[PDB]
Amino acid sequence: VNQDGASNGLTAPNGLSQQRVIRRALAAAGLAPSDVDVVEAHGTGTTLG
Amino acid sequence: PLPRRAAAKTASLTERLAGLAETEQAAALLDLVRRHAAEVLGHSGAESVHSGRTFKDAGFDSLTAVELRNRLAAATGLTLSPAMIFDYPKPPALADHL
Amino acid sequence: SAGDPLLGTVVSTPGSDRLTAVAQWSRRAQPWAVDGLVPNAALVEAAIRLGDLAGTPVVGELVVDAPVVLPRRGSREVQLIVGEPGEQRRRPIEVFSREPWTRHAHGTLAPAAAAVPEPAAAGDATDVTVAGLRDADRYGIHPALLDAAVRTVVGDDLLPSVWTGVSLLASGATAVTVTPTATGLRLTDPAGQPVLTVESVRGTPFVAEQGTTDALFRVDWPEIPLPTAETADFLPYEATSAEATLSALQAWLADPAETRLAVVTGDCTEPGAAAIWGLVRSAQSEHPGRIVLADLDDPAVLPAVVASGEPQVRVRNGVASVPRLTRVTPRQDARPLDPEGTVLITGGTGTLGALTARHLVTAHGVRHLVLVSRRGEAPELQEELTALGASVAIAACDVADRAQLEAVLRAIPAEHPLTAVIHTAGVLDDGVVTELTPDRLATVRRPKVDAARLLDELTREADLAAFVLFSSAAGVLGNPGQAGYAAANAELDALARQRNSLDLPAVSIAWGYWATVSGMTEHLGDADLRRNQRIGMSGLPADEGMALLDAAIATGGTLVAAKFDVAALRATAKAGGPVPPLLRGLA
Amino acid sequence: EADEPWTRHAHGTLAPAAAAVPEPAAAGDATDVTVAGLRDADRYGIHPA
Amino acid sequence: SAGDPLLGTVVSTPGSDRLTAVAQWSRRAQPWAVDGLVPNAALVEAAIR
């Protein structure tokens, strides 16, 4: 779990935060990106997100 | 029945364009955008908003962005994009672009 | 709530075109009403707003009798009334606000004119803006803008109270340009287009409105059912005089029997029966639920009256009535006090006498006063009244003494005839029923009742504009420890009633306890204050007291001028609290 | 309703509180009437239903 | 404040004793009233009110 913090706006997301949180979760699980084969994205449908 | 006509807060676009002489430098545009920004945020006056900072420091969002663009385009009569706030971070940049 | 804030709720009379706009105006709701003083521009704007709904936007004529002062706590009810369309489709317009209805403005309303003439400019156009002019959209013209714009011609000191030919062309203005005309003015938008036009506006100096006289109450006798009762817990006795009634009450208070006493007297309006009723009322105030007052033509209904539950009952022809205090609308058409006349004041050397003299001189312009009392020495008050333009003669006289009162009255010059006698003389000798004696009763009664009798009999042939008897509420509402004072006040009211029945002026005020700030309630105990707050009584300031005195002089008869907390007593009634029998009509 | 012409539905005269209320002879049996689901009857002197 | 549902608000005519009780009656506010129809008992109760 992490907070994006600074961005374009208050609710704007930053890809760097998602990268960092994904890496942190994978390191905690002690696995590799090739190990997983399916991921459920947020899929909000926003033209920005 | 139709309601009574709305009393204009200031002069119309034609009267301004008469006052916005091309001889006059980037000053009328500056003060009008300052007034628009002050009224957008509910500032006490156009003097409170300062051109030294950017709109991001003033606390502007896409909500205020599109409506300020509307209130500026209608005042000036010219069609505008919804995103000069990021293209032009400074009020002088807005004035020179306009 | 979608109605206009100054319009509130709009009601149309079925079968008629009359329109009533009811609004609640408070300083919280109307910040622009400085101190609560509503600018006349707000009234003009509200009239225009309602006339828009009536189809007549052009104010044909508006005259503001007086502005509106919003209360510090609570909101004033404001009603604007639109009458039927007359000639030229003009409709009568009236404004009221409230206490008795107070008219503030009136005039006529006209439809839109086909031609909008442009009068010549009689002055320099100036830009008018208002800082803090919020929600200007909710008004066609914001009142705080219109008043500022019109002050440029009428003047800040002058309240603009006259408006003619008011026409509106724009809405939601924030800044204006004012071009005055010969009579009216023109307000235009910063864009230059016309916004509002006034054919003519005229201002008047501000006049401080008098204190509202809504504390005047009269003793009314509503009918009540008489229960079908034959035997009841009562002790019958025929009370003949005040002294006999007090002696019987003392005997019963020494009697350990827990049996109620039914005081049977004559007609309560009789001065002796009035004193009896006052003494019994004071004893009941001391001992509630144990004594009953009866004024019965036929005493056979006496147990029924005892079964009625009301301590004070008058029965005639089998129908019973009870005393209550009911507010009376103050009168307008009062005979003016003659400046060339002379006003005699009894007990003028006291605080209340000096206050009454000062009020008369300041308001009614009484240039000649005769202030008489036991002491009759007041160089300070004499100088105060003379510096106000009043020729004052101060006398050491016993108002209840025939020779001295006659000498005082004859001391008045013939060229300044007597026109008003205010009987403020009164000696306060407080005492409970168990301790009072007839000697103390006479000592209390002589400076008030005998003095009033002497004054009215001596001034029977005099052309008197007013004859004031300074009674007190203790004789009507009842007051423990003031039985003699209560009897004196009740007999004073009875004397005023008899004098009025004798085709002569007589006004008696049974005032409640005054305000502590006035400095004339120092002898009131804490128990008195607690009982007053329990029954809803509140202090009376000097200004409102004298205003109520003037209103009662206008009205005449017997009135009770006392301030009561309305909502508190209504809630007490709703809570089943201790509403006094006299206040049962109130609550 | 809204701005329709006003329609009169009832008319009469209101009298002050009477002193004595005669009790007429009973012209029928005493009937006990209760309304199920009665709500907020206190705010009425008597519930309309 | 929501007063008596059959009363609503009360207006006193200045310079007169005439009174007018104005209210808004809706089936939601008066569920006991059948199918919009108002029994005359409600009218009597409002008159007493």
PDB file of N, CA and C in Angstrom, chain C residues 79-163:
ATOM      1  N   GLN C  79     -46.272  42.198   6.134  1.00  0.00           N
ATOM      2  CA  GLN C  79     -47.334  41.870   5.195  1.00  0.00           C
ATOM      3  C   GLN C  79     -47.491  43.019   4.213  1.00  0.00           C
ATOM      4  N   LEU C  80     -47.381  42.711   2.928  1.00  0.00           N
ATOM      5  CA  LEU C  80     -47.599  43.684   1.867  1.00  0.00           C
ATOM      6  C   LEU C  80     -48.879  43.293   1.142  1.00  0.00           C
ATOM      7  N   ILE C  81     -49.821  44.228   1.071  1.00  0.00           N
ATOM      8  CA  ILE C  81     -51.167  43.968   0.578  1.00  0.00           C
ATOM      9  C   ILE C  81     -51.376  44.736  -0.719  1.00  0.00           C
ATOM     10  N   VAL C  82     -51.851  44.025  -1.737  1.00  0.00           N
ATOM     11  CA  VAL C  82     -52.130  44.558  -3.063  1.00  0.00           C
ATOM     12  C   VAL C  82     -53.640  44.519  -3.246  1.00  0.00           C
ATOM     13  N   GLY C  83     -54.240  45.679  -3.502  1.00  0.00           N
ATOM     14  CA  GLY C  83     -55.676  45.791  -3.637  1.00  0.00           C
ATOM     15  C   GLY C  83     -56.154  45.557  -5.057  1.00  0.00           C
ATOM     16  N   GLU C  84     -57.464  45.710  -5.235  1.00  0.00           N
ATOM     17  CA  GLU C  84     -58.077  45.480  -6.530  1.00  0.00           C
ATOM     18  C   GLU C  84     -57.647  46.558  -7.522  1.00  0.00           C
ATOM     19  N   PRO C  85     -57.494  46.207  -8.799  1.00  0.00           N
ATOM     20  CA  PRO C  85     -57.109  47.210  -9.803  1.00  0.00           C
ATOM     21  C   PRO C  85     -58.242  48.198 -10.040  1.00  0.00           C
ATOM     22  N   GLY C  86     -57.950  49.476  -9.848  1.00  0.00           N
ATOM     23  CA  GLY C  86     -58.904  50.549 -10.067  1.00  0.00           C
ATOM     24  C   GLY C  86     -58.765  51.154 -11.447  1.00  0.00           C
ATOM     25  N   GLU C  87     -58.935  52.471 -11.522  1.00  0.00           N
ATOM     26  CA  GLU C  87     -58.746  53.168 -12.786  1.00  0.00           C
ATOM     27  C   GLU C  87     -57.292  53.059 -13.231  1.00  0.00           C
ATOM     28  N   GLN C  88     -57.093  53.033 -14.549  1.00  0.00           N
ATOM     29  CA  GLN C  88     -55.780  52.832 -15.158  1.00  0.00           C
ATOM     30  C   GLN C  88     -55.130  51.534 -14.689  1.00  0.00           C
ATOM     31  N   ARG C  89     -55.946  50.576 -14.246  1.00  0.00           N
ATOM     32  CA  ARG C  89     -55.474  49.305 -13.695  1.00  0.00           C
ATOM     33  C   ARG C  89     -54.505  49.523 -12.537  1.00  0.00           C
ATOM     34  N   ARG C  90     -54.732  50.580 -11.764  1.00  0.00           N
ATOM     35  CA  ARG C  90     -53.922  50.876 -10.595  1.00  0.00           C
ATOM     36  C   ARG C  90     -54.506  50.193  -9.368  1.00  0.00           C
ATOM     37  N   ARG C  91     -53.616  49.711  -8.507  1.00  0.00           N
ATOM     38  CA  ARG C  91     -54.021  48.941  -7.348  1.00  0.00           C
ATOM     39  C   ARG C  91     -53.471  49.580  -6.082  1.00  0.00           C
ATOM     40  N   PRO C  92     -54.264  49.634  -5.013  1.00  0.00           N
ATOM     41  CA  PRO C  92     -53.755  50.184  -3.751  1.00  0.00           C
ATOM     42  C   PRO C  92     -52.724  49.251  -3.135  1.00  0.00           C
ATOM     43  N   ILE C  93     -51.660  49.841  -2.604  1.00  0.00           N
ATOM     44  CA  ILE C  93     -50.532  49.115  -2.040  1.00  0.00           C
ATOM     45  C   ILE C  93     -50.387  49.553  -0.592  1.00  0.00           C
ATOM     46  N   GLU C  94     -50.310  48.589   0.324  1.00  0.00           N
ATOM     47  CA  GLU C  94     -50.085  48.900   1.729  1.00  0.00           C
ATOM     48  C   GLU C  94     -49.044  47.965   2.323  1.00  0.00           C
ATOM     49  N   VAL C  95     -48.331  48.464   3.330  1.00  0.00           N
ATOM     50  CA  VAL C  95     -47.293  47.710   4.020  1.00  0.00           C
ATOM     51  C   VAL C  95     -47.575  47.760   5.513  1.00  0.00           C
ATOM     52  N   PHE C  96     -47.519  46.604   6.168  1.00  0.00           N
ATOM     53  CA  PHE C  96     -47.693  46.509   7.607  1.00  0.00           C
ATOM     54  C   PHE C  96     -46.624  45.591   8.176  1.00  0.00           C
ATOM     55  N   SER C  97     -46.319  45.774   9.457  1.00  0.00           N
ATOM     56  CA  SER C  97     -45.330  44.930  10.112  1.00  0.00           C
ATOM     57  C   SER C  97     -45.601  44.886  11.606  1.00  0.00           C
ATOM     58  N   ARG C  98     -45.278  43.751  12.215  1.00  0.00           N
ATOM     59  CA  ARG C  98     -45.399  43.601  13.662  1.00  0.00           C
ATOM     60  C   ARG C  98     -44.426  42.562  14.208  1.00  0.00           C
ATOM     61  N   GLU C  99     -47.914  42.136  18.692  1.00  0.00           N
ATOM     62  CA  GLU C  99     -48.077  43.585  18.734  1.00  0.00           C
ATOM     63  C   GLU C  99     -49.003  44.060  17.617  1.00  0.00           C
ATOM     64  N   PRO C 100     -49.681  45.194  17.840  1.00  0.00           N
ATOM     65  CA  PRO C 100     -50.628  45.702  16.837  1.00  0.00           C
ATOM     66  C   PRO C 100     -49.986  45.986  15.488  1.00  0.00           C
ATOM     67  N   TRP C 101     -50.768  45.830  14.420  1.00  0.00           N
ATOM     68  CA  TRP C 101     -50.274  46.066  13.071  1.00  0.00           C
ATOM     69  C   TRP C 101     -49.800  47.505  12.917  1.00  0.00           C
ATOM     70  N   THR C 102     -48.609  47.665  12.349  1.00  0.00           N
ATOM     71  CA  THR C 102     -47.999  48.974  12.151  1.00  0.00           C
ATOM     72  C   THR C 102     -47.822  49.213  10.660  1.00  0.00           C
ATOM     73  N   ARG C 103     -48.566  50.172  10.118  1.00  0.00           N
ATOM     74  CA  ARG C 103     -48.435  50.519   8.710  1.00  0.00           C
ATOM     75  C   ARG C 103     -47.179  51.352   8.496  1.00  0.00           C
ATOM     76  N   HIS C 104     -46.390  50.977   7.492  1.00  0.00           N
ATOM     77  CA  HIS C 104     -45.136  51.655   7.201  1.00  0.00           C
ATOM     78  C   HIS C 104     -45.131  52.402   5.879  1.00  0.00           C
ATOM     79  N   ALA C 105     -45.865  51.923   4.877  1.00  0.00           N
ATOM     80  CA  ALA C 105     -45.888  52.576   3.578  1.00  0.00           C
ATOM     81  C   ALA C 105     -47.216  52.291   2.894  1.00  0.00           C
ATOM     82  N   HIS C 106     -47.568  53.164   1.954  1.00  0.00           N
ATOM     83  CA  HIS C 106     -48.823  53.031   1.226  1.00  0.00           C
ATOM     84  C   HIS C 106     -48.719  53.811  -0.075  1.00  0.00           C
ATOM     85  N   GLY C 107     -49.591  53.470  -1.017  1.00  0.00           N
ATOM     86  CA  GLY C 107     -49.585  54.158  -2.295  1.00  0.00           C
ATOM     87  C   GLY C 107     -50.423  53.431  -3.326  1.00  0.00           C
ATOM     88  N   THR C 108     -50.118  53.707  -4.590  1.00  0.00           N
ATOM     89  CA  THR C 108     -50.803  53.103  -5.722  1.00  0.00           C
ATOM     90  C   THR C 108     -49.784  52.527  -6.692  1.00  0.00           C
ATOM     91  N   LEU C 109     -50.195  51.476  -7.395  1.00  0.00           N
ATOM     92  CA  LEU C 109     -49.339  50.759  -8.327  1.00  0.00           C
ATOM     93  C   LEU C 109     -49.979  50.766  -9.709  1.00  0.00           C
ATOM     94  N   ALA C 110     -49.158  50.977 -10.731  1.00  0.00           N
ATOM     95  CA  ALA C 110     -49.612  51.165 -12.099  1.00  0.00           C
ATOM     96  C   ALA C 110     -48.945  50.167 -13.038  1.00  0.00           C
ATOM     97  N   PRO C 111     -49.586  49.843 -14.165  1.00  0.00           N
ATOM     98  CA  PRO C 111     -48.959  48.931 -15.132  1.00  0.00           C
ATOM     99  C   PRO C 111     -47.794  49.572 -15.866  1.00  0.00           C
ATOM    100  N   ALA C 112     -47.153  48.809 -16.747  1.00  0.00           N
ATOM    101  CA  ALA C 112     -46.012  49.320 -17.493  1.00  0.00           C
ATOM    102  C   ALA C 112     -46.460  50.387 -18.483  1.00  0.00           C
ATOM    103  N   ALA C 113     -45.732  51.499 -18.516  1.00  0.00           N
ATOM    104  CA  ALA C 113     -46.040  52.580 -19.438  1.00  0.00           C
ATOM    105  C   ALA C 113     -45.509  52.261 -20.829  1.00  0.00           C
ATOM    106  N   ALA C 114     -46.314  52.575 -21.845  1.00  0.00           N
ATOM    107  CA  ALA C 114     -45.885  52.351 -23.221  1.00  0.00           C
ATOM    108  C   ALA C 114     -44.696  53.233 -23.581  1.00  0.00           C
ATOM    109  N   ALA C 115     -44.700  54.480 -23.124  1.00  0.00           N
ATOM    110  CA  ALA C 115     -43.631  55.429 -23.405  1.00  0.00           C
ATOM    111  C   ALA C 115     -42.770  55.606 -22.164  1.00  0.00           C
ATOM    112  N   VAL C 116     -41.455  55.512 -22.343  1.00  0.00           N
ATOM    113  CA  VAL C 116     -40.505  55.719 -21.253  1.00  0.00           C
ATOM    114  C   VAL C 116     -39.728  57.000 -21.537  1.00  0.00           C
ATOM    115  N   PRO C 117     -40.232  58.161 -21.126  1.00  0.00           N
ATOM    116  CA  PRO C 117     -39.522  59.413 -21.404  1.00  0.00           C
ATOM    117  C   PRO C 117     -38.208  59.495 -20.645  1.00  0.00           C
ATOM    118  N   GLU C 118     -37.260  60.226 -21.227  1.00  0.00           N
ATOM    119  CA  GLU C 118     -35.945  60.411 -20.620  1.00  0.00           C
ATOM    120  C   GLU C 118     -35.821  61.839 -20.112  1.00  0.00           C
ATOM    121  N   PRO C 119     -35.952  62.072 -18.810  1.00  0.00           N
ATOM    122  CA  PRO C 119     -35.830  63.435 -18.285  1.00  0.00           C
ATOM    123  C   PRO C 119     -34.403  63.952 -18.388  1.00  0.00           C
ATOM    124  N   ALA C 120     -34.292  65.278 -18.401  1.00  0.00           N
ATOM    125  CA  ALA C 120     -32.994  65.923 -18.529  1.00  0.00           C
ATOM    126  C   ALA C 120     -32.120  65.627 -17.316  1.00  0.00           C
ATOM    127  N   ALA C 121     -30.815  65.544 -17.558  1.00  0.00           N
ATOM    128  CA  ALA C 121     -29.860  65.307 -16.484  1.00  0.00           C
ATOM    129  C   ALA C 121     -29.665  66.584 -15.676  1.00  0.00           C
ATOM    130  N   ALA C 122     -29.909  66.503 -14.369  1.00  0.00           N
ATOM    131  CA  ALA C 122     -29.753  67.642 -13.474  1.00  0.00           C
ATOM    132  C   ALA C 122     -28.525  67.522 -12.583  1.00  0.00           C
ATOM    133  N   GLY C 123     -27.636  66.577 -12.863  1.00  0.00           N
ATOM    134  CA  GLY C 123     -26.446  66.416 -12.047  1.00  0.00           C
ATOM    135  C   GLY C 123     -25.480  65.451 -12.694  1.00  0.00           C
ATOM    136  N   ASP C 124     -24.303  65.354 -12.083  1.00  0.00           N
ATOM    137  CA  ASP C 124     -23.233  64.522 -12.613  1.00  0.00           C
ATOM    138  C   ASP C 124     -23.503  63.053 -12.312  1.00  0.00           C
ATOM    139  N   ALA C 125     -23.350  62.208 -13.328  1.00  0.00           N
ATOM    140  CA  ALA C 125     -23.497  60.772 -13.138  1.00  0.00           C
ATOM    141  C   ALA C 125     -22.320  60.230 -12.336  1.00  0.00           C
ATOM    142  N   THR C 126     -22.617  59.409 -11.333  1.00  0.00           N
ATOM    143  CA  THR C 126     -21.595  58.838 -10.467  1.00  0.00           C
ATOM    144  C   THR C 126     -21.766  57.329 -10.402  1.00  0.00           C
ATOM    145  N   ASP C 127     -20.651  56.611 -10.307  1.00  0.00           N
ATOM    146  CA  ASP C 127     -20.688  55.157 -10.245  1.00  0.00           C
ATOM    147  C   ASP C 127     -20.903  54.724  -8.800  1.00  0.00           C
ATOM    148  N   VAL C 128     -21.947  53.933  -8.578  1.00  0.00           N
ATOM    149  CA  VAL C 128     -22.309  53.437  -7.257  1.00  0.00           C
ATOM    150  C   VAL C 128     -22.067  51.934  -7.233  1.00  0.00           C
ATOM    151  N   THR C 129     -21.232  51.497  -6.291  1.00  0.00           N
ATOM    152  CA  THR C 129     -20.996  50.091  -6.009  1.00  0.00           C
ATOM    153  C   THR C 129     -21.096  49.878  -4.508  1.00  0.00           C
ATOM    154  N   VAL C 130     -21.439  48.656  -4.115  1.00  0.00           N
ATOM    155  CA  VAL C 130     -21.594  48.298  -2.711  1.00  0.00           C
ATOM    156  C   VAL C 130     -20.679  47.120  -2.415  1.00  0.00           C
ATOM    157  N   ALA C 131     -19.770  47.304  -1.462  1.00  0.00           N
ATOM    158  CA  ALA C 131     -18.965  46.194  -0.976  1.00  0.00           C
ATOM    159  C   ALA C 131     -19.825  45.282  -0.112  1.00  0.00           C
ATOM    160  N   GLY C 132     -19.729  43.977  -0.352  1.00  0.00           N
ATOM    161  CA  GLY C 132     -20.580  43.031   0.335  1.00  0.00           C
ATOM    162  C   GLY C 132     -21.964  42.874  -0.254  1.00  0.00           C
ATOM    163  N   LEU C 133     -22.200  43.395  -1.458  1.00  0.00           N
ATOM    164  CA  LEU C 133     -23.491  43.245  -2.115  1.00  0.00           C
ATOM    165  C   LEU C 133     -23.640  41.830  -2.657  1.00  0.00           C
ATOM    166  N   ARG C 134     -23.928  40.879  -1.776  1.00  0.00           N
ATOM    167  CA  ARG C 134     -24.046  39.476  -2.141  1.00  0.00           C
ATOM    168  C   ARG C 134     -25.442  39.169  -2.669  1.00  0.00           C
ATOM    169  N   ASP C 135     -25.554  38.008  -3.320  1.00  0.00           N
ATOM    170  CA  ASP C 135     -26.782  37.488  -3.919  1.00  0.00           C
ATOM    171  C   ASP C 135     -27.584  38.563  -4.646  1.00  0.00           C
ATOM    172  N   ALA C 136     -26.893  39.422  -5.400  1.00  0.00           N
ATOM    173  CA  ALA C 136     -27.574  40.461  -6.162  1.00  0.00           C
ATOM    174  C   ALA C 136     -28.492  39.888  -7.234  1.00  0.00           C
ATOM    175  N   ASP C 137     -28.276  38.634  -7.637  1.00  0.00           N
ATOM    176  CA  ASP C 137     -29.150  38.006  -8.622  1.00  0.00           C
ATOM    177  C   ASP C 137     -30.567  37.831  -8.090  1.00  0.00           C
ATOM    178  N   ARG C 138     -30.710  37.534  -6.796  1.00  0.00           N
ATOM    179  CA  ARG C 138     -32.021  37.320  -6.196  1.00  0.00           C
ATOM    180  C   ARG C 138     -32.902  38.561  -6.241  1.00  0.00           C
ATOM    181  N   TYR C 139     -32.321  39.735  -6.457  1.00  0.00           N
ATOM    182  CA  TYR C 139     -33.068  40.972  -6.620  1.00  0.00           C
ATOM    183  C   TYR C 139     -32.913  41.460  -8.051  1.00  0.00           C
ATOM    184  N   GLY C 140     -33.951  42.112  -8.576  1.00  0.00           N
ATOM    185  CA  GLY C 140     -33.745  42.900  -9.776  1.00  0.00           C
ATOM    186  C   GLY C 140     -32.766  44.028  -9.533  1.00  0.00           C
ATOM    187  N   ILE C 141     -33.028  44.842  -8.513  1.00  0.00           N
ATOM    188  CA  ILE C 141     -32.070  45.781  -7.932  1.00  0.00           C
ATOM    189  C   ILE C 141     -31.894  45.417  -6.468  1.00  0.00           C
ATOM    190  N   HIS C 142     -30.651  45.229  -6.047  1.00  0.00           N
ATOM    191  CA  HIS C 142     -30.397  44.984  -4.639  1.00  0.00           C
ATOM    192  C   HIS C 142     -30.728  46.235  -3.827  1.00  0.00           C
ATOM    193  N   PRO C 143     -31.427  46.085  -2.699  1.00  0.00           N
ATOM    194  CA  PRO C 143     -31.770  47.268  -1.889  1.00  0.00           C
ATOM    195  C   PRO C 143     -30.564  48.077  -1.452  1.00  0.00           C
ATOM    196  N   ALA C 144     -29.481  47.405  -1.054  1.00  0.00           N
ATOM    197  CA  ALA C 144     -28.285  48.108  -0.611  1.00  0.00           C
ATOM    198  C   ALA C 144     -27.623  48.877  -1.742  1.00  0.00           C
ATOM    199  N   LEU C 145     -27.929  48.535  -2.993  1.00  0.00           N
ATOM    200  CA  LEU C 145     -27.452  49.332  -4.114  1.00  0.00           C
ATOM    201  C   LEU C 145     -28.365  50.527  -4.360  1.00  0.00           C
ATOM    202  N   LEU C 146     -29.681  50.297  -4.341  1.00  0.00           N
ATOM    203  CA  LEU C 146     -30.625  51.364  -4.651  1.00  0.00           C
ATOM    204  C   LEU C 146     -30.578  52.475  -3.610  1.00  0.00           C
ATOM    205  N   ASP C 147     -30.479  52.120  -2.325  1.00  0.00           N
ATOM    206  CA  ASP C 147     -30.432  53.156  -1.297  1.00  0.00           C
ATOM    207  C   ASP C 147     -29.170  54.002  -1.424  1.00  0.00           C
ATOM    208  N   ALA C 148     -28.029  53.363  -1.690  1.00  0.00           N
ATOM    209  CA  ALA C 148     -26.793  54.110  -1.889  1.00  0.00           C
ATOM    210  C   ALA C 148     -26.886  55.012  -3.113  1.00  0.00           C
ATOM    211  N   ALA C 149     -27.488  54.512  -4.196  1.00  0.00           N
ATOM    212  CA  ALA C 149     -27.627  55.320  -5.402  1.00  0.00           C
ATOM    213  C   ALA C 149     -28.535  56.521  -5.170  1.00  0.00           C
ATOM    214  N   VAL C 150     -29.623  56.334  -4.420  1.00  0.00           N
ATOM    215  CA  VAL C 150     -30.559  57.431  -4.198  1.00  0.00           C
ATOM    216  C   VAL C 150     -30.058  58.409  -3.141  1.00  0.00           C
ATOM    217  N   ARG C 151     -29.162  57.979  -2.248  1.00  0.00           N
ATOM    218  CA  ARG C 151     -28.580  58.909  -1.287  1.00  0.00           C
ATOM    219  C   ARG C 151     -27.737  59.978  -1.966  1.00  0.00           C
ATOM    220  N   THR C 152     -27.286  59.731  -3.197  1.00  0.00           N
ATOM    221  CA  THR C 152     -26.533  60.728  -3.947  1.00  0.00           C
ATOM    222  C   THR C 152     -27.370  61.946  -4.308  1.00  0.00           C
ATOM    223  N   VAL C 153     -28.696  61.859  -4.193  1.00  0.00           N
ATOM    224  CA  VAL C 153     -29.597  62.968  -4.476  1.00  0.00           C
ATOM    225  C   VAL C 153     -30.416  63.343  -3.248  1.00  0.00           C
ATOM    226  N   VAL C 154     -31.083  62.360  -2.640  1.00  0.00           N
ATOM    227  CA  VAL C 154     -31.870  62.618  -1.438  1.00  0.00           C
ATOM    228  C   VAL C 154     -30.969  63.036  -0.283  1.00  0.00           C
ATOM    229  N   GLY C 155     -29.853  62.338  -0.099  1.00  0.00           N
ATOM    230  CA  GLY C 155     -28.950  62.641   0.992  1.00  0.00           C
ATOM    231  C   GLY C 155     -28.865  61.520   2.006  1.00  0.00           C
ATOM    232  N   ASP C 156     -27.689  61.352   2.614  1.00  0.00           N
ATOM    233  CA  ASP C 156     -27.519  60.303   3.615  1.00  0.00           C
ATOM    234  C   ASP C 156     -28.391  60.557   4.837  1.00  0.00           C
ATOM    235  N   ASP C 157     -28.469  61.812   5.284  1.00  0.00           N
ATOM    236  CA  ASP C 157     -29.247  62.139   6.472  1.00  0.00           C
ATOM    237  C   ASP C 157     -30.745  61.989   6.248  1.00  0.00           C
ATOM    238  N   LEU C 158     -31.217  62.169   5.019  1.00  0.00           N
ATOM    239  CA  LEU C 158     -32.640  62.131   4.714  1.00  0.00           C
ATOM    240  C   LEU C 158     -33.025  60.747   4.214  1.00  0.00           C
ATOM    241  N   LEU C 159     -34.000  60.135   4.872  1.00  0.00           N
ATOM    242  CA  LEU C 159     -34.530  58.864   4.406  1.00  0.00           C
ATOM    243  C   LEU C 159     -35.452  59.118   3.221  1.00  0.00           C
ATOM    244  N   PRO C 160     -35.188  58.536   2.054  1.00  0.00           N
ATOM    245  CA  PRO C 160     -36.070  58.769   0.903  1.00  0.00           C
ATOM    246  C   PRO C 160     -37.399  58.052   1.069  1.00  0.00           C
ATOM    247  N   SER C 161     -38.462  58.813   1.328  1.00  0.00           N
ATOM    248  CA  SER C 161     -39.752  58.230   1.657  1.00  0.00           C
ATOM    249  C   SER C 161     -40.799  58.403   0.569  1.00  0.00           C
ATOM    250  N   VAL C 162     -40.542  59.228  -0.440  1.00  0.00           N
ATOM    251  CA  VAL C 162     -41.489  59.475  -1.521  1.00  0.00           C
ATOM    252  C   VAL C 162     -40.895  58.927  -2.809  1.00  0.00           C
ATOM    253  N   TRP C 163     -41.688  58.149  -3.542  1.00  0.00           N
ATOM    254  CA  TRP C 163     -41.252  57.597  -4.818  1.00  0.00           C
ATOM    255  C   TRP C 163     -42.405  57.667  -5.805  1.00  0.00           C
TER     256      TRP C 163
END
